[PDB]
Amino acid sequence: FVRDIVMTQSPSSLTVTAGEKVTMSCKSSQSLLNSGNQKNYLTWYQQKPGQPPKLLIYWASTRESGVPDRFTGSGSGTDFTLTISSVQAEDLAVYYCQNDYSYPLTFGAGTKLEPEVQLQQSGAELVRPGASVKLSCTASGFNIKDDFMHWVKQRPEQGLEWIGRIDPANDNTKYAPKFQDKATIIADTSSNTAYLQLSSLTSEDTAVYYCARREVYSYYSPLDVWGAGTTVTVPSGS
């Protein structure tokens, strides 16, 4: 029996006052270190309400282009931390750390701070328990045959859940254990679109589903481009 690798973030919530110094902790059940290239496969995401996760840092300490120096990713192997030397207003939001070492990719519960390349996703869905629905994701600025198309889930809670990913070139797919049955990811390079189908829907499926890409031409790259997401509502009843 092979685990999954748990990401434990703390504190979950933290009222903060401008200027203050915040320190978020992210621990993993298992090593995230690749002794081969001595890199720690840990990525940090910042998420403001109503929006999809924004890439903050990857490989534990490397800041994505555009993120202010006041943000610092540190840690190694199993203990990681994100620090904001002086919290700004536009800094609020929630923060998630992600295991990018081995499948299935898993996200932490995150730390909520209390006071043209893009992906087009299909419209919002309203479905009955037991039914199935197909979500779409079309790349508008690149060729999906050059990327791994991922599908991420997120219920009202906040926790991000990796569903799986597919290789449009060889149609190779990888699914998270718990979604191996409820989900099916398909790719149509012709239209440059990725699909995700959920079957036997329950209220447990009510959430926001995001699609994302990972370039495969670079030596390595995290999940940078995320669509706006499609809200799927499965009202329970009868």
């Binding site: 081969g36 496969y41 081995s102 499948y103 990719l105 290789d167 060889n170 495969v216």
Partner: peptide
């Protein structure tokens, strides 16, 4: 498996 899956994908 990630870094290995990428290499395999590109190569």
């Amino acid at each position: 498996v990630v870094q290995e899956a990428l290499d395999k994908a590109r190569e």
